[PDB]
Amino acid sequence: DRVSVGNLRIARVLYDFVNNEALPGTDIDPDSFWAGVDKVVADLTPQNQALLNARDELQAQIDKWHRRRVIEPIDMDAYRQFLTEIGYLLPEPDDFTITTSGVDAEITTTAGPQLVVPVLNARFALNAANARWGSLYDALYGTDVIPETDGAEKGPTYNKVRGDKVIAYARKFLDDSVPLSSGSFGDATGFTVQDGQLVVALPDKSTGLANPGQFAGYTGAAESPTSVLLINHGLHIEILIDPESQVGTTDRAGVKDVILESAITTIMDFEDSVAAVDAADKVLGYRNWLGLNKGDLAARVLNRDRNYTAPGGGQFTLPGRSLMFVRNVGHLMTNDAIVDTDGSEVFEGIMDALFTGLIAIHGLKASGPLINSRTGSIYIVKPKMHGPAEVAFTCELFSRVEDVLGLPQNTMKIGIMDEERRTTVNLKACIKAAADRVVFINTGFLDRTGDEIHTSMEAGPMVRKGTMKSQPWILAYEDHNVDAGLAAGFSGRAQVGKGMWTMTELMADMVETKIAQPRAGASTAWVPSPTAATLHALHYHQVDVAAVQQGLAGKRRATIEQLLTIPLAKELAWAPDEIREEVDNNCQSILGYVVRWVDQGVGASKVPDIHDVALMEDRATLRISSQLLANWLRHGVITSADVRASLERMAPLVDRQNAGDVAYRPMAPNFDDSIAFLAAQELILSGAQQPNGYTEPILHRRRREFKARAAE
Numbered sequence: 001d002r003v004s005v006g007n008l009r010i011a012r013v014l015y016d017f018v019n020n021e022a023l024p025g026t027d028i029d030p031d032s033f034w035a036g037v038d039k040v041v042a043d044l045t046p047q048n049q050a051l052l053n054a055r056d057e058l059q060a061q062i063d064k065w066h067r068r069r070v071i072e073p074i075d076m077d078a079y080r081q082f083l084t085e086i087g088y089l090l091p092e093p094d095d096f097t098i099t100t101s102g103v104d105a106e107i108t109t110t111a112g113p114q115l116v117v118p119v120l121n122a123r124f125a126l127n128a129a130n131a132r133w134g135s136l137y138d139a140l141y142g143t144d145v146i147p148e149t150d151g152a153e154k155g156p157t158y159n160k161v162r163g164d165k166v167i168a169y170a171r172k173f174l175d176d177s178v179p180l181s182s183g184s185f186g187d188a189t190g191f192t193v194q195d196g197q198l199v200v201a202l203p204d205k206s207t208g209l210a211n212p213g214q215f216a217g218y219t220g221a222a223e224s225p226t227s228v229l230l231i232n233h234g235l236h237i238e239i240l241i242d243p244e245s246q247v248g249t250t251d252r253a254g255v256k257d258v259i260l261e262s263a264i265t266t267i268m269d270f271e272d273s274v275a276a277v278d279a280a281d282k283v284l285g286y287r288n289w290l291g292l293n294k295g296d297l298a299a300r301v302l303n304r305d306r307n308y309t310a311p312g313g314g315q316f317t318l319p320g321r322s323l324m325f326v327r328n329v330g331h332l333m334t335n336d337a338i339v340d341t342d343g344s345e346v347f348e349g350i351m352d353a354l355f356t357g358l359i360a361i362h363g364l365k366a367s368g369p370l371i372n373s374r375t376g377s378i379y380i381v382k383p384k385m386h387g388p389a390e391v392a393f394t395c396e397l398f399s400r401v402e403d404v405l406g407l408p409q410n411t412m413k414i415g416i417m418d419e420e421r422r423t424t425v426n427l428k429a430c431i432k433a434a435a436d437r438v439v440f441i442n443t444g445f446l447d448r449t450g451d452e453i454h455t456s457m458e459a460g461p462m463v464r465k466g467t468m469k470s471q472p473w474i475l476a477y478e479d480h481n482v483d484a485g486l487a488a489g490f491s492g493r494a495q496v497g498k499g500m501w502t503m504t505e506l507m508a509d510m511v512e513t514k515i516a517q518p519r520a521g522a523s524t525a526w527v528p529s530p531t532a533a534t535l536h537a538l539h540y541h542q543v544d545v546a547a548v549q550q551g552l553a554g555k556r557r558a559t560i561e562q563l564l565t566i567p568l569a570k571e572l573a574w575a576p577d578e579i580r581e582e583v584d585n586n587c588q589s590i591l592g593y594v595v596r597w598v599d600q601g602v603g604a605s606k607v608p609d610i611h612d613v614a615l616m617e618d619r620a621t622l623r624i625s626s627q628l629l630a631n632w633l634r635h636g637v638i639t640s641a642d643v644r645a646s647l648e649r650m651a652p653l654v655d656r657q658n659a660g661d662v663a664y665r666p667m668a669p670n671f672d673d674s675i676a677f678l679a680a681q682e683l684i685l686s687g688a689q690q691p692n693g694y695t696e697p698i699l700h701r702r703r704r705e706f707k708a709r710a711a712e
């Protein structure tokens with residue numbers, strides 16, 4: 001079952017995959033590759049373990065500090081000086097500008113949605129890569145952005161009252177984004193190109209654009225184009241003109257659809273949205289990443305570039321696919337896909353850098369044309385780092401991998417998640433540690449909330465999970481991230497990103513509220529579906545992010561004291577029914593997510609909460625819920641009987657929600673026989689003892705336990 005290379009014992013399925021699938025076409029010699037793996041693992045594992053031990057030592061000191069605190073209001077001056085003494089809060093370096101070069105325009109310049117998808121799901125990954133262009137009509141008709149009120153309800157058949165509202169919404173979008181010199185797109189009867197500029201026919205007169213430079217191109221004949229291509233805030237809009245179509249036949253100008261450039265970049269996720277606990281799982285993911293980079297992943301295939309005629313009459317093309325990042329796992333976990341001679345598992349983050357890096361070489365070379373970075377970069381998101389020494393380690397790991405792969409130094413770029421408190425409070429130093437590799441920072445606010453709870457676990461009971469979004473610490477955290485990014489010269493060089501919209505069915509709400517993120521100067525933010533990407537694209541047409549960033553330059557809007565404000569609840573805060581609701585809600589969301597993780601290896605699941613809101617769950621939202629209940633149990637807000645009773649009460653409700661689903665095995669009534677139930681319980685009752693409250697140690701162990709049982 002294993003292959004010996006030096007000190008390593010490689011699972012045969014991984015050895016075969018790399019030799020037969022990943023290496024051919026890279027001109028890397030297999031024996032040299034595997035010797036490189038052995039040397040990188042041997043050389044870098046000590047520092048990897050040392051960093052993990054440092055996390056544990058720091059947390060132990062903070063725990064003890066809070067237990068020895070007498071004064072009720074935390075003396076913030078004493079707290080801050082303590083974090084400085086133990087090396088948690090480090091000195092801020094002098095101002096600098098990042099030097100990362102060779103980065104694609106989608107990252108340096110284009111503000112727009114960033115889509116995250118589990119790499120183990122080939123169909124979702126394909127749809128994500130293809131989500132660079134998406135139908136606004138479909139996004140509006142298929143979601144609640146257009147209310148299902150007055151005869152506008154969806155049904156088995158196309159509803160023209162609803163379709164007309166879709167059309168009107170899109171016409172107002174055009175008026176607001178590419179305004180006519182006079183009149184409205186709602187009254188357009190036709191489009192032509194005359195002397196290289198767009199002419200819109202109105203019933204009374206004709207008109208051009210208020211800014212004719214927004215006219216980017218067209219398809220078909222200039223006198224009766226089959227489509228018109230507009231650009232606004234660097235994002236493209238395509239009006240499809242087809243009077244013979246069913247929609248276009250009813251349209252006053254024969255418009256069939258409005259196509260939005262949507263998911264500019266996509267993150268193919270190996271981390272919190274997938275369940276991969278052994279070599280077999282990792283190979284499934286690596287193979288999908290390989291198919292994406294070679295261009296031949298198919299279930300349904302990857303799109304080619306798009307051909308246009310320039311306003312002046314020449315030819316040009318536009319990228320048809322989303323520019324792909326890969327999210328590697330972070331520094332914590334090992335995986336038995338490789339073990340050493342003594343049987344120790346190899347760090348999974350090290351493996352991901354080698355193998356996803358190797359596979360990404362295919363995306364730098366011809367498919368027809370090369371799939372991904374035309375400028376020669378490989379884009380890796382590195383999650384869950386704690387402070388600048390951990391960022392420096394990632395950079396050293398990437399350097400060593402580049403040597404093994406024979407790639408130019410600094411080929412492998414890094415998207416830094418700002419999703420751990422020791423990174424937040426040292427963010428300037430963290431960016432500087434990666435100043436020649438960094439291509440984004442992003443506030444992973446869900447992980448950051450989990451780390452907020454775990455770090456101050458001993459200080460007292462935290463506010464309810466739903467209250468966290470309005471706490472001083474998180475508002476400071478979001479502003480601080482933008483400030484540090486802009487201060488490091490990110491405008492025009494690297495993305496400043498914000499976090500995930502999880503309410504998959506509440507697209508009217510997303511359109512209403514997620515505009516806050518580009519208004520806050522973020523040049524990208526996360527969505528979980530191609531449809532959400534198309535709708536979030538609307539916000540970048542309304543908000544001039546480049547303008548917003550220029551206005552924000554130089555501002556210092558968060559103090560260290562605000563960043564360090566612990567989200568403690570006030571005494572007497574909750575009635576029994578409020579406590580009960582928090583416990584039930586958290587138990588339901590935990591059980592709903594964990595049961596499909598452990599029994600079916602699904603790392604991202606839509607789970608209705610106690611208010612029947614469909615939430616896209618992954619490990620970070622699980623980290624919050626389990627840590628909050630662990631915190632409430634730790635400080636006596638709830639008893640161990642309360643937790644067990646809530647889990648038992650919500651488990652059959654999860655069983656019912658899954659009912660069919662044929663691979664689903666119920667948790668109730670024999671709770672002590674359900675590995676999934678016991679994993680959910682363990683995440684709560686052992687939550688305080690998990691490193692930084694991470695969920696992977698328990699999830700991976702319980703999933704492997706489930707697989708072992710299904711094997712015998």
Ligand SMILES: O=C(O)/C(O)=C/C(=O)c1cccc(O)c1Br
Nearest residue numbers: 116272444445446447616618620
């Ligand atoms: O805020 C973080 O810590 C972060 O990393 C976000 C996620 O990973 C996430 C959360 C929910 C659904 C989903 O698809 C994803 Br990708």
Ligand SMILES: [Mg+2]
Nearest residue numbers: 060063688689
């Ligand atoms: Mg302890």
Ligand SMILES: [Mg+2]
Nearest residue numbers: 419444447620
């Ligand atoms: Mg995260």
Ligand SMILES: [Mg+2]
Nearest residue numbers: 463464467569
């Ligand atoms: Mg509260």
Ligand SMILES: [Mg+2]
Nearest residue numbers: 233541543544
């Ligand atoms: Mg504008």
